[PDB]
Amino acid sequence: MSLFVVNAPGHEGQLKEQLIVAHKRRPLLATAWVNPPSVLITNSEGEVLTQVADPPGSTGRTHQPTALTWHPNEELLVIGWSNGEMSLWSMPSVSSLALGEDYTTAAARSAVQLIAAKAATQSSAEGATREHASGAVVASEWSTRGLYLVSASQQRHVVMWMLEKIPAETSVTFKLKPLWSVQSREPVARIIHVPSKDDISFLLADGGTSVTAINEDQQLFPCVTQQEQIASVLYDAATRTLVTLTTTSMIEVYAVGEDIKGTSTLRRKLSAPATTPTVSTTTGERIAMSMVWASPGVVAFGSGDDRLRILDLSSGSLDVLLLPQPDLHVSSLATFAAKGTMIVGTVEGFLVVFQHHAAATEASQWEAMTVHQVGKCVDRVVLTALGDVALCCGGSELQVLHEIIRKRAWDGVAAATQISSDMVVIESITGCQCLLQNKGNVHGVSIAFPNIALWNGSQIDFYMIDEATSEITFINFVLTTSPAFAIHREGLIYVKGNRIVFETMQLAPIAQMTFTESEGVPVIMDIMNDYLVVVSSKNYLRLARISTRDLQQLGPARPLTFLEVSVSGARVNAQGRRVALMSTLGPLALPDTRIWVYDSDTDKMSFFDFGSRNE
Amino acid sequence: MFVYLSKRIAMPNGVKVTSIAWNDGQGWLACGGEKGLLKVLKVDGGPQGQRSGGLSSSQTLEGHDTTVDLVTWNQQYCKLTSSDVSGRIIVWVLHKGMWFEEMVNNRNSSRVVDFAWNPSGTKIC
């Protein structure tokens, strides 16, 4: 199957569960921590990029960030603090640095985004404190095209901000300037935007009975009217639907047209019994209501119970899809539209991942793929652009879970299996079963017994097992970043830059000829017996035979014929002739239901699909 | 002829506007405001920017101190002329979407009242 690798950027500050945000297209993530009050901006893998505090001028008043929002297409964050100051964090773009044009692999982009985040900047909007009148920015929101901003405070002050992009002589800066200063009836909680299909019009919800929109006419007018308190409002821009679940858990779906007026279509009484309610006394607060957009046309909500309640707006049907077990208190929910996957977080410490069947009964369309027991109570769940899921655990704790397949290998003597982020069980047919722990997380496993190399992204460490004493000790590391590495009795074969380096255990070079950009950077490699297969980033296939001295390339580089269909894994048979290929679909690394076989003798590529078997 | 409101655009900071001039050559609209505020928008007058009122470009300009009061255009060479209450007259030249200052004048004795281009666009009063 597959598992998450858990990266926790360590900080003892008290994280606010309500203030973790993710850029919707760029793979970044911002978090706000209290004691000390600061903002950690990390990448999508939980690796810290930068730490942000109050801009200089503070006389010891390290203010507390209260709202963070992303730019919908730029790498730009805006932070509303506790004093009403509106800061703006901007990293310089890579193309502004005018460096080399080889920066197209993921690792180089990660490194340059790291150094650019270290070279980022913070700016202050002029007069923003006065417009909020020294009031904490309780909400902010960008437009769909992201040139209008709206900031709402606890003094009911709502301010619209125009975005000005100023191309400097050597860079690009940004400014946010106030337009209006209006007042609401209450401190507004959630601000949503509506597109026309640019147009400036924002809905506002203070958590009361009525939601107030504002448009370019500078008028604050209600759209839907309810006699009971509302908590969360779900907006669907494609259908412009506005779904409100009342504090008494009543369905109110409003179709909203161009008039910004909601018309109810389905509203049926739901009998939730009040016999010995489970009032949240462990947290001392009202149970948080949770609903998100599960699928186009279908909305899910968990009521904090052991059940998950789905609602089909197309047919008006509301049903329940249960978890595999009873006794699961759902706390927070999220859904990835790219993969059609819902993420269910439980107070007990479980994440349940539901997958669209097309990604009988309609409720059978969702099905739970993986149950990951984190062992800690989750506060908030936020997905990223790539699919990595961030969790808030225990208030002050944050984790970032990245979904990978379990690395494992079988040389012929012993099998290595990955069981955690950094725990690897190595087990031979002689009973030599032992567990090993790494400094960093496991990203690649290769075995040629008793030598066993593990790659942790930034470097590979190859460990030696003295089975006479059964002692394992680190010796030396190879600082490379490619996913292509494979160990052998002859030596270790990895990728440094464009070069595919073959060395011994003491790193004595064996084969060294420099590759070109046309040949490209190999990404995938497989070693077995005396045969090797290399797959580059451009579908190029290079078979090879490893010997005591050289790497005899059995023929030239070959392409293969299959959004786009990439290559993620390859295994060659013991004759060094047939190669099994694992394909993926789309840039989202979606799994593919067919597998490929390349025969070099006839140079054919046959295939077999598993979607016929529903597999 | 029928006149109907189609769009309202609020300039930054809520400063009262005092001088508006539109260029025939490419649709460069100019706006002046108190405390040395000068703004230039580019609205597409074609059918793409007709039904939607497409505000293609924006650019804030600086160089004035008092309230900008006198703004005029020149369509043939697409030049701008601006003034203020202080008496600073600035001519602006387009270059790659950037309005460069070309000349700054001030009589320092009297308030400039109005501009006047010849229809050929070669003389300014």
XYZ file of C-alpha atoms in Angstrom:
740
model
C 0.000 0.000 0.000
C 1.227 3.459 0.960
C 1.836 5.698 3.957
C 2.461 9.262 5.020
C 5.859 10.554 6.022
C 5.433 12.934 8.948
C 7.629 16.031 9.055
C 7.217 18.315 12.066
C 9.075 21.630 11.786
C 10.025 21.942 15.414
C 8.860 24.952 17.369
C 7.721 25.223 20.974
C 5.421 28.141 20.165
C 1.681 27.743 20.531
C 0.296 27.168 17.050
C -3.138 28.561 16.251
C -5.166 25.871 14.496
C -7.252 28.548 12.763
C -4.191 30.124 11.128
C -2.629 27.490 8.875
C -3.001 28.406 5.199
C -1.769 26.920 1.943
C -1.103 28.541 -1.408
C -3.606 26.999 -3.797
C -1.174 26.618 -6.719
C 2.359 27.131 -5.426
C 3.440 24.433 -2.935
C 3.880 26.566 0.181
C 2.259 26.781 3.605
C 2.071 29.479 6.272
C 1.512 28.970 9.996
C 1.041 31.390 12.885
C 2.575 30.535 16.261
C 2.022 32.216 19.622
C 4.540 32.469 22.488
C 6.616 33.630 20.663
C 4.203 35.335 18.246
C 5.654 34.643 14.807
C 4.844 33.147 11.404
C 6.626 30.104 10.003
C 6.429 29.877 6.213
C 7.412 26.401 5.032
C 7.272 24.454 1.799
C 4.769 21.693 1.079
C 6.956 19.086 2.822
C 7.094 20.824 6.201
C 10.655 22.041 5.689
C 11.056 25.535 7.119
C 11.664 28.209 4.497
C 11.542 31.374 6.622
C 10.435 32.759 9.984
C 8.633 36.116 10.152
C 8.202 38.556 13.046
C 7.135 42.188 13.451
C 8.888 44.649 11.118
C 11.356 46.912 12.931
C 10.096 49.923 14.839
C 8.408 47.922 17.576
C 9.163 49.086 21.122
C 8.990 45.537 22.454
C 5.412 44.920 21.260
C 5.874 41.732 19.261
C 2.358 41.723 17.856
C 0.278 38.619 17.262
C -0.644 37.674 13.673
C -4.379 37.118 13.353
C -5.040 36.384 9.672
C -2.936 35.047 6.812
C -4.002 34.860 3.181
C -2.217 33.797 0.003
C -2.163 35.275 -3.424
C -4.163 33.017 -5.783
C -1.373 32.939 -8.396
C 1.693 34.695 -6.944
C 3.993 33.670 -4.107
C 2.630 36.444 -1.920
C 1.267 36.386 1.624
C -0.513 39.085 3.585
C -0.670 39.001 7.390
C -3.092 40.898 9.591
C -1.687 41.269 13.093
C -3.359 42.006 16.427
C -2.765 45.776 16.226
C -4.304 46.218 12.775
C -0.973 46.538 10.987
C -1.167 44.827 7.598
C 2.145 43.288 6.607
C 2.971 41.710 3.264
C 5.535 38.944 2.795
C 6.944 38.581 -0.718
C 9.614 36.268 -2.028
C 11.531 37.351 -5.144
C 10.805 35.245 -8.190
C 13.351 32.789 -9.573
C 13.333 34.369 -13.040
C 14.218 37.705 -11.416
C 17.522 36.207 -10.230
C 18.751 35.708 -13.843
C 20.536 32.452 -13.005
C 21.004 29.445 -15.293
C 18.216 27.827 -17.287
C 18.764 24.257 -16.056
C 16.460 24.862 -13.053
C 13.679 22.529 -14.171
C 14.035 19.558 -11.808
C 12.094 19.506 -8.552
C 15.141 19.564 -6.269
C 16.733 22.603 -7.920
C 13.404 24.430 -7.719
C 13.165 23.502 -4.036
C 16.675 24.811 -3.352
C 16.143 28.071 -5.227
C 12.769 28.621 -3.554
C 14.485 27.999 -0.215
C 17.166 30.605 -0.879
C 14.601 33.042 -2.308
C 12.419 32.591 0.774
C 15.548 33.386 2.763
C 15.837 36.435 0.467
C 12.172 37.453 0.826
C 10.877 40.754 2.206
C 8.191 42.237 4.442
C 6.333 45.482 3.719
C 3.791 47.545 5.655
C 0.630 49.097 4.245
C 0.508 52.812 5.012
C -2.211 53.975 7.384
C -3.634 50.463 7.773
C -3.600 50.727 11.573
C -5.694 53.905 11.449
C -8.252 52.406 9.052
C -8.772 49.441 11.368
C -8.472 51.942 14.277
C -5.962 49.724 16.123
C -8.259 46.701 15.774
C -7.098 43.133 15.224
C -7.588 41.899 11.659
C -9.995 39.030 12.251
C -10.358 38.174 8.559
C -8.942 38.902 5.125
C -9.650 37.662 1.615
C -8.354 38.089 -1.933
C -10.525 38.178 -5.022
C -10.651 35.282 -7.476
C -8.280 37.130 -9.808
C -6.459 38.446 -6.747
C -6.167 42.200 -7.137
C -8.812 43.202 -4.573
C -8.361 42.448 -0.876
C -10.828 42.798 1.990
C -9.827 43.065 5.647
C -12.387 42.825 8.450
C -11.637 43.500 12.110
C -13.283 43.007 15.498
C -14.397 46.659 15.551
C -16.702 45.689 12.635
C -14.432 47.700 10.328
C -14.328 46.354 6.772
C -11.786 47.861 4.381
C -11.303 47.146 0.682
C -7.726 47.247 -0.608
C -6.477 47.751 -4.150
C -3.342 45.848 -5.154
C -0.663 47.772 -7.062
C 2.170 45.764 -8.627
C 5.153 48.104 -9.023
C 7.943 46.704 -11.236
C 11.136 48.013 -9.652
C 14.348 48.600 -11.593
C 15.713 45.220 -10.435
C 12.694 43.434 -8.896
C 8.914 43.645 -8.412
C 7.231 45.112 -5.323
C 3.595 45.247 -4.260
C 1.436 47.736 -2.383
C -2.041 47.560 -0.863
C -4.036 50.760 -0.622
C -7.341 51.356 1.194
C -10.505 52.202 -0.721
C -13.525 52.069 1.629
C -14.093 52.009 5.389
C -17.491 50.485 6.159
C -18.973 48.992 9.325
C -20.751 45.691 9.939
C -23.200 44.769 12.667
C -20.747 42.288 14.220
C -17.120 41.184 13.805
C -17.266 39.306 10.513
C -15.884 35.764 10.643
C -15.697 34.404 7.082
C -15.323 36.434 3.879
C -16.122 34.773 0.551
C -15.817 36.105 -2.993
C -18.099 35.662 -6.007
C -16.925 35.692 -9.642
C -19.067 37.021 -12.469
C -19.101 33.777 -14.474
C -12.444 40.818 -12.123
C -15.810 41.708 -10.614
C -15.451 42.960 -7.040
C -18.133 41.628 -4.684
C -17.573 39.944 -1.320
C -19.964 38.048 0.915
C -19.411 38.435 4.648
C -20.542 36.259 7.551
C -20.196 37.259 11.204
C -21.588 33.968 12.506
C -25.047 35.407 13.192
C -28.417 34.993 11.497
C -27.893 36.964 8.255
C -25.007 37.221 5.772
C -24.105 40.612 4.290
C -22.612 41.118 0.844
C -20.848 44.235 -0.388
C -20.168 45.245 -3.986
C -18.639 48.177 -5.875
C -21.702 50.277 -4.982
C -20.312 50.484 -1.405
C -23.531 49.012 0.010
C -23.741 46.282 2.657
C -26.911 44.314 1.991
C -28.146 40.854 3.030
C -28.556 37.954 0.608
C -30.150 35.089 2.549
C -32.201 35.575 5.701
C -32.373 32.981 8.467
C -34.029 33.190 11.866
C -31.347 31.049 13.536
C -27.624 31.558 13.997
C -25.439 30.436 11.100
C -21.889 29.184 11.545
C -20.320 28.288 8.183
C -21.294 29.159 4.617
C -20.172 27.039 1.657
C -19.890 28.796 -1.698
C -19.647 27.041 -5.068
C -18.579 29.501 -7.758
C -19.303 27.214 -10.720
C -22.959 26.881 -9.704
C -22.851 29.932 -7.368
C -24.539 27.747 -4.738
C -24.609 28.953 -1.120
C -25.128 26.149 1.406
C -25.775 27.044 5.044
C -25.963 24.515 7.870
C -27.616 26.078 10.902
C -26.397 25.826 14.476
C -29.378 23.486 14.926
C -28.088 21.449 11.925
C -30.746 22.357 9.370
C -30.060 22.239 5.642
C -30.532 25.507 3.734
C -29.204 25.451 0.163
C -29.657 28.719 -1.721
C -29.290 29.116 -5.444
C -27.684 32.534 -5.921
C -28.003 34.416 -9.190
C -26.591 37.700 -10.425
C -28.830 39.615 -7.996
C -26.784 38.223 -5.045
C -30.013 36.807 -3.598
C -30.315 33.288 -2.225
C -33.385 31.201 -3.043
C -33.920 28.070 -0.960
C -34.329 24.819 -2.896
C -33.973 22.016 -0.334
C -34.738 22.456 3.354
C -36.030 19.419 5.254
C -36.194 18.910 9.014
C -33.457 16.703 10.473
C -34.222 15.034 13.824
C -30.996 14.965 15.813
C -31.903 13.684 19.304
C -30.966 15.653 22.416
C -30.872 12.659 24.783
C -27.700 13.056 26.909
C -25.683 15.154 24.433
C -21.899 14.883 24.333
C -21.143 18.488 25.243
C -17.473 19.200 24.578
C -16.131 19.648 28.108
C -12.608 18.418 27.327
C -12.088 21.503 25.150
C -14.503 23.750 27.050
C -16.049 25.057 23.825
C -18.986 24.407 21.532
C -18.365 21.549 19.108
C -17.093 22.920 15.815
C -19.408 22.420 12.858
C -17.721 20.915 9.809
C -18.807 20.874 6.180
C -16.822 21.060 2.936
C -17.450 20.518 -0.768
C -16.946 16.789 -1.275
C -17.573 16.616 -5.025
C -19.031 18.821 -7.765
C -22.691 18.859 -6.769
C -22.204 16.842 -3.549
C -21.514 18.347 -0.110
C -20.294 16.413 2.926
C -20.516 17.249 6.613
C -19.492 15.492 9.795
C -21.481 16.361 12.901
C -18.748 15.354 15.344
C -20.352 11.915 15.691
C -19.161 8.491 14.521
C -20.949 8.985 11.188
C -20.222 10.950 8.020
C -23.204 12.565 6.311
C -23.191 13.198 2.559
C -25.766 15.303 0.704
C -26.366 15.192 -3.052
C -27.590 18.619 -4.159
C -28.463 17.258 -7.613
C -31.083 14.808 -6.309
C -31.698 16.312 -2.869
C -30.673 13.023 -1.253
C -28.896 13.002 2.108
C -27.375 9.729 3.294
C -24.621 8.444 5.581
C -21.340 6.762 4.679
C -19.909 5.215 7.827
C -16.275 4.811 8.783
C -14.846 1.253 8.932
C -15.220 1.297 12.740
C -17.581 2.829 15.275
C -16.215 5.176 17.958
C -14.665 7.886 15.792
C -15.285 11.526 16.741
C -14.759 13.595 13.586
C -13.104 16.941 14.336
C -12.071 18.541 11.025
C -12.558 17.726 7.356
C -10.918 18.554 4.027
C -11.164 17.413 0.418
C -8.739 17.366 -2.519
C -10.546 18.101 -5.768
C -7.525 17.038 -7.826
C -7.683 13.400 -6.707
C -11.297 13.339 -5.526
C -10.136 12.502 -2.009
C -11.609 13.475 1.357
C -9.452 13.649 4.492
C -11.250 12.781 7.735
C -9.562 13.778 10.988
C -10.616 12.242 14.290
C -10.073 13.317 17.890
C -8.780 9.818 18.679
C -5.951 10.381 16.189
C -7.068 8.820 12.911
C -6.953 10.139 9.362
C -9.272 8.337 6.956
C -8.726 8.970 3.250
C -11.724 8.566 0.943
C -11.213 8.128 -2.800
C -13.625 8.747 -5.654
C -14.348 5.463 -7.435
C -14.031 7.112 -10.853
C -10.748 8.778 -9.853
C -24.806 0.251 -7.598
C -25.405 2.752 -4.795
C -24.239 6.363 -4.934
C -22.831 6.200 -1.394
C -20.569 3.331 -2.481
C -18.853 5.804 -4.837
C -16.722 7.026 -1.945
C -14.510 4.444 -0.274
C -11.852 4.742 2.418
C -8.382 3.921 1.099
C -6.002 4.402 4.028
C -6.452 4.692 7.785
C -3.450 6.419 9.360
C -3.364 6.398 13.161
C -1.369 9.480 14.111
C -2.027 8.825 17.802
C -2.721 12.481 18.612
C -5.828 14.659 18.580
C -6.007 16.723 15.380
C -7.320 20.287 15.512
C -7.358 21.472 11.891
C -6.640 19.823 8.533
C -5.336 21.828 5.560
C -4.371 20.406 2.180
C -1.681 21.861 -0.076
C -1.329 22.289 -3.827
C 0.409 18.940 -4.350
C -1.797 16.875 -2.009
C 0.331 16.985 1.141
C -1.859 17.349 4.218
C -0.956 19.506 7.214
C -2.428 18.801 10.644
C -2.625 20.785 13.859
C -2.119 18.420 16.804
C -2.464 19.351 20.463
C -2.756 23.069 19.801
C 0.944 23.943 19.838
C 1.901 20.982 17.627
C 2.000 20.903 13.831
C 2.703 18.010 11.486
C 2.915 17.722 7.703
C 2.020 14.340 6.231
C 3.200 13.598 2.697
C 1.772 10.542 0.963
C 4.335 8.136 -0.532
C 4.517 4.484 -1.476
C 6.388 2.184 0.899
C 9.952 1.696 -0.276
C 11.090 -1.916 -0.180
C 13.640 -4.133 -1.870
C 14.679 -7.761 -2.277
C 18.248 -8.440 -3.403
C 18.096 -12.227 -3.200
C 19.587 -12.666 0.267
C 17.555 -10.308 2.460
C 14.425 -8.217 2.012
C 14.243 -4.637 3.269
C 10.875 -3.104 4.127
C 10.006 0.422 5.204
C 7.549 0.634 8.100
C 7.670 4.306 9.129
C 9.254 7.612 8.163
C 12.685 6.380 9.254
C 12.293 2.797 10.547
C 13.406 0.017 8.186
C 13.156 -3.717 8.901
C 15.784 -5.858 7.164
C 15.103 -9.580 7.217
C 16.936 -12.463 5.565
C 15.969 -16.090 5.020
C 18.447 -16.942 7.802
C 16.257 -15.239 10.409
C 18.473 -12.124 10.469
C 15.560 -9.796 11.209
C 16.557 -6.427 12.630
C 15.160 -2.903 12.758
C 17.121 0.253 11.950
C 16.394 3.931 12.589
C 17.661 6.754 10.380
C 18.413 10.385 11.150
C 16.098 11.610 8.393
C 13.071 10.184 6.659
C 13.314 7.225 4.289
C 13.076 8.140 0.609
C 14.964 5.328 -1.118
C 15.965 1.763 -0.241
C 18.556 -0.374 -2.012
C 20.136 -3.612 -0.804
C 23.064 -5.805 -1.859
C 23.568 -7.848 1.284
C 25.116 -6.953 3.720
C 25.507 -3.462 2.196
C 22.280 -1.468 2.329
C 21.887 2.136 1.136
C 19.081 4.466 2.219
C 18.513 7.824 0.530
C 16.914 10.631 2.551
C 16.544 13.231 -0.174
C 19.588 15.371 0.542
C 22.005 12.435 0.766
C 22.409 8.663 0.757
C 23.871 6.727 3.672
C 25.040 3.181 2.960
C 25.238 0.963 6.028
C 27.340 -2.154 6.454
C 26.053 -5.150 8.415
C 28.641 -7.294 10.145
C 26.447 -10.368 10.616
C 29.217 -12.078 12.600
C 28.598 -9.434 15.268
C 25.270 -8.276 13.731
C 26.527 -4.694 14.044
C 25.425 -1.861 11.745
C 27.206 1.494 11.615
C 27.108 4.530 9.351
C 30.337 5.086 7.424
C 30.023 7.894 4.862
C 27.361 9.761 2.909
C 26.926 10.659 -0.753
C 25.285 14.094 -0.941
C 23.021 13.724 -3.971
C 19.400 14.642 -4.610
C 18.245 12.397 -7.452
C 15.654 9.651 -6.881
C 17.898 7.358 -8.947
C 20.285 5.291 -6.828
C 21.009 1.572 -6.560
C 23.640 -0.381 -4.648
C 25.414 -3.509 -5.881
C 28.212 -5.920 -5.021
C 30.413 -4.006 -7.467
C 29.502 -0.639 -5.968
C 26.925 2.118 -5.660
C 25.448 3.705 -8.801
C 23.750 7.065 -8.285
C 23.292 10.391 -10.083
C 25.375 13.484 -9.304
C 24.205 16.365 -11.473
C 24.041 15.162 -15.058
C 26.624 12.459 -14.338
C 25.633 8.909 -13.409
C 28.384 8.005 -10.959
C 29.507 4.428 -10.292
C 31.732 4.047 -7.229
C 32.888 1.455 -4.713
C 32.109 1.250 -0.996
C 35.016 3.627 -0.309
C 33.730 5.783 -3.218
C 36.429 4.890 -5.724
C 35.177 6.084 -9.140
C 34.632 3.365 -11.741
C 32.720 4.836 -14.699
C 32.749 8.571 -15.409
C 31.674 10.205 -18.673
C 29.813 13.506 -18.545
C 26.241 13.529 -19.840
C 24.563 16.369 -21.733
C 21.266 18.221 -21.507
C 20.020 16.372 -24.601
C 20.625 13.072 -22.821
C 19.227 14.683 -19.688
C 19.084 13.698 -16.042
C 18.234 10.070 -15.165
C 15.471 9.783 -12.572
C 14.837 6.031 -12.267
C 17.273 3.143 -12.002
C 17.047 -0.566 -11.253
C 19.842 -3.017 -10.393
C 19.559 -6.784 -10.296
C 22.290 -9.415 -10.688
C 24.463 -8.030 -13.489
C 21.870 -5.852 -15.213
C 20.739 -2.252 -14.822
C 17.974 -0.092 -16.291
C 17.994 3.717 -16.320
C 14.976 5.885 -17.163
C 15.604 9.595 -17.585
C 13.246 12.553 -17.188
C 12.449 12.444 -20.928
C 11.180 8.822 -21.166
C 14.614 7.712 -22.461
C 15.393 4.080 -21.643
C 19.005 2.918 -21.285
C 19.592 -0.757 -20.638
C 23.027 -1.601 -19.302
C 25.113 -4.514 -18.077
C 27.315 -4.001 -15.036
C 30.559 -5.957 -14.897
C 33.672 -6.060 -12.728
C 35.143 -3.035 -14.500
C 32.684 -1.116 -16.688
C 29.034 -0.404 -17.515
C 28.488 -1.845 -20.990
C 25.454 -0.042 -22.400
C 23.403 -2.743 -24.152
C 22.400 -0.571 -27.077
C 21.624 3.140 -27.274
C 19.080 5.205 -25.387
C 15.526 4.342 -26.376
C 12.205 6.178 -26.106
C 8.889 4.545 -25.283
C 5.371 5.206 -26.556
C 2.370 5.360 -24.228
C -2.820 14.210 -19.323
C 0.693 12.972 -20.036
C 1.856 9.534 -18.901
C 5.122 9.534 -16.952
C 7.339 6.737 -15.593
C 7.849 6.100 -11.877
C 9.262 2.572 -11.576
C 10.996 -0.065 -13.647
C 12.238 -3.589 -12.954
C 14.348 -5.702 -15.314
C 14.316 -9.495 -15.469
C 17.322 -11.714 -14.764
C 18.148 -11.911 -18.478
C 18.486 -8.126 -18.619
C 16.043 -8.112 -21.527
C 12.469 -7.347 -20.438
C 11.636 -4.271 -18.366
C 8.433 -3.833 -16.384
C 7.256 -0.216 -16.316
C 4.950 1.479 -13.824
C 3.179 4.470 -15.341
C 1.408 7.406 -13.724
C -1.189 9.829 -15.063
C -1.110 13.605 -14.927
C 1.201 16.001 -13.094
C -0.541 15.103 -9.819
C 1.273 11.720 -9.828
C -2.061 9.940 -10.057
C -1.718 6.140 -10.186
C -2.343 4.368 -13.469
C -4.452 1.248 -13.919
C -2.193 -0.320 -16.568
C 1.335 -1.720 -16.447
C 3.885 -1.944 -19.244
C 6.377 -4.534 -20.496
C 9.217 -3.573 -22.848
C 11.000 -6.385 -24.687
C 14.346 -5.287 -26.113
C 14.710 -8.307 -28.416
C 11.576 -7.390 -30.349
C 11.725 -3.852 -28.852
C 7.977 -4.016 -28.231
C 5.955 -2.456 -25.422
C 2.923 -4.505 -24.424
C 0.635 -3.651 -21.536
C -2.067 -4.953 -19.245
C -4.711 -2.877 -17.484
C -6.166 -3.497 -14.042
C -9.244 -1.278 -14.333
C -10.844 -4.244 -16.077
C -10.360 -6.067 -12.767
C -11.382 -2.947 -10.782
C -7.837 -2.879 -9.402
C -29.064 59.415 -26.964
C -29.346 57.265 -23.833
C -26.955 57.694 -20.909
C -26.768 54.978 -18.265
C -24.281 54.313 -15.488
C -22.171 51.246 -16.212
C -19.211 51.340 -13.844
C -17.895 53.076 -10.745
C -14.166 53.055 -9.997
C -12.902 54.240 -6.617
C -9.353 55.557 -6.639
C -7.118 54.788 -3.624
C -7.283 56.544 -0.237
C -10.701 58.132 -0.868
C -9.266 61.445 -2.093
C -11.584 63.800 -3.969
C -10.933 63.858 -7.721
C -10.394 67.267 -9.320
C -9.201 66.729 -12.914
C -10.124 64.064 -15.470
C -8.832 63.803 -19.037
C -9.195 60.982 -21.557
C -6.819 60.279 -24.442
C -8.268 59.393 -27.838
C -5.066 57.759 -29.069
C -5.041 54.635 -26.905
C -7.634 55.117 -24.154
C -5.322 56.477 -21.457
C -7.598 58.069 -18.869
C -6.050 60.479 -16.384
C -7.241 61.421 -12.903
C -6.025 64.059 -10.470
C -6.530 64.256 -6.731
C -5.553 66.269 -3.689
C -2.155 66.148 -1.962
C -0.332 65.571 -5.243
C -2.285 62.561 -6.484
C -1.936 61.624 -10.149
C -3.353 58.407 -11.592
C -3.415 56.997 -15.126
C -5.614 54.104 -16.200
C -5.721 52.348 -19.553
C -9.220 51.208 -20.522
C -9.662 49.166 -23.685
C -12.252 50.852 -25.875
C -12.630 47.835 -28.134
C -15.462 45.321 -27.936
C -13.467 43.202 -25.479
C -13.382 46.207 -23.144
C -16.771 47.593 -24.222
C -19.303 45.121 -22.810
C -17.155 44.364 -19.755
C -15.654 47.852 -19.420
C -12.180 46.341 -19.416
C -9.740 48.259 -17.213
C -6.590 46.947 -18.848
C -3.859 48.829 -16.987
C -3.188 51.068 -13.994
C -0.276 53.326 -13.059
C 0.145 55.833 -10.241
C 2.250 58.883 -11.069
C 4.131 61.218 -8.747
C 5.794 64.599 -9.053
C 3.040 66.916 -7.851
C 2.660 68.346 -4.351
C -0.646 70.241 -4.186
C -4.002 69.228 -5.665
C -3.799 68.217 -9.320
C -6.290 70.472 -11.088
C -5.395 70.836 -14.793
C -4.874 67.730 -16.940
C -4.893 67.596 -20.732
C -3.883 65.216 -23.502
C -2.342 65.269 -26.955
C -3.557 62.449 -29.175
C -1.104 62.607 -32.091
C 2.017 62.288 -29.930
C 0.071 60.754 -26.992
C 1.568 63.259 -24.558
C 0.155 64.423 -21.237
C 0.195 67.807 -19.535
C -0.518 68.269 -15.836
C -0.549 71.044 -13.250
C -1.355 71.595 -9.581
C -2.412 74.327 -7.170
C 1.234 75.100 -6.349
C 1.973 75.968 -9.972
C 4.099 73.047 -11.133
C 3.448 72.118 -14.770
C 4.732 68.733 -15.932
C 4.611 67.169 -19.398
C 4.587 63.370 -19.482
C 5.842 61.135 -22.295
C 4.875 57.492 -22.729
C 7.674 54.937 -23.014
C 7.022 51.183 -22.613
C 4.024 51.877 -20.395
C 6.026 54.294 -18.225
C 5.185 57.997 -18.108
C 8.460 59.897 -17.945
C 8.580 63.496 -16.827
C 9.843 65.608 -19.725
C 9.754 69.186 -18.412
C 8.848 70.888 -15.137
C 7.945 74.576 -15.044
C 6.706 77.037 -12.444
C 6.032 80.735 -12.913
C 6.174 81.012 -9.080
C 4.094 84.209 -9.265
C 0.679 83.330 -10.711
C -1.648 80.337 -10.767
C -1.902 78.510 -14.083
C -5.533 78.453 -15.192
C -5.839 76.208 -18.241
C -4.028 74.451 -21.073
C -4.824 74.597 -24.770
C -3.455 72.441 -27.592
C -3.781 73.365 -31.230
C -5.855 70.871 -33.255
C -2.672 69.879 -35.085
C -1.162 69.110 -31.682
C 2.023 71.144 -32.123
C 1.432 74.247 -29.974
C 0.343 74.539 -26.348
C -1.161 77.609 -24.691
